[PDB]
Amino acid sequence: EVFNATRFASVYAWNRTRISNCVADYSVLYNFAPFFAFKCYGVSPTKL
Amino acid sequence: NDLCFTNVYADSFVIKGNEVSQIAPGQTGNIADYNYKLPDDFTGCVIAW
Ligand SMILES: *[C@@H]1O[C@H](CO)[C@@H](O[C@@H]2O[C@H](CO)[C@@H](O)[C@H](O)[C@@H]2O)[C@H](O)[C@H]1NC(C)=O
Ligand SMILES: *[C@@H]1O[C@H](CO)[C@@H](O)[C@H](O)[C@H]1NC(C)=O
């Protein structure tokens, strides 16, 4: 519901959701996303 | 012109304009991840014309 949305706001108002109390399987991160830039800085995407 | 190399590999492939900037040691993208990944401790040159 952060990736199935329809009105990702403009950058001047960067919508900020909070994700807590959950199991983060980033395979659903990959599925809604024909990626062009997955640049991770603090962590490696493979070990997420 | 003042160096001696044990062996030299010439990998050749035609790619799109942004993908030229893509090809480098330690990069990301659809090409640098699934098509051609230059190793991090690369010792060589890239040529794009
Ligand atoms: C950022 O956009 C998200 C998706 O549109 C919002 O999450 C949802 O918002 C709807 C209301 O539009 C809620 O009913 C739903 O429970 C869920 O929270 C999110 O609120 C929004 N955040 C901000 C700060 O605008
Ligand atoms: C958005 O939700 C619809 C619901 O049917 C789904 O079909 C679609 O694939 C989703 N798209 C994205 C980008 O999440």
Rounded-to-integer distance, Cα A32 and Cα B46, Å: 34
Distance separating alpha carbons of residues B9 and B44, to the nearest angstrom: 9
Q: Is A29 helix (H, G, I), strand (E, B) or coil?
A: helix
Q: Residue A9 is encoded by which pair of tokens?
A: 């706001």
- Of the residues B16, B22, B30, B34, the best mutation for testing chain A's interface (the one with the most A CB atoms within 10 Å of its CB) is B30
For B9, half-sphere exposure in the C-beta direction (CA atoms, 13 angstrom radius) is 5
Considering only CA atoms, which of A5, A2, A3, A31 is closest in space to residue A17?
Answer: A2
Cβ neighbourhood burial of A45 (10 Å; 0-12, 13-18, 19+): middle
CB contact under 8 A, A36 and B30: yes
Q: Which residue has a Cα nearest atom 17 of ligand 1?
A: A1
Tokens 């090809």, located at residue: B23
Copy the structure tokens of residue B13: 């492939």
Tell me how crowded residue B23 is: count the other CB atoms within 10 A of its CB: 19
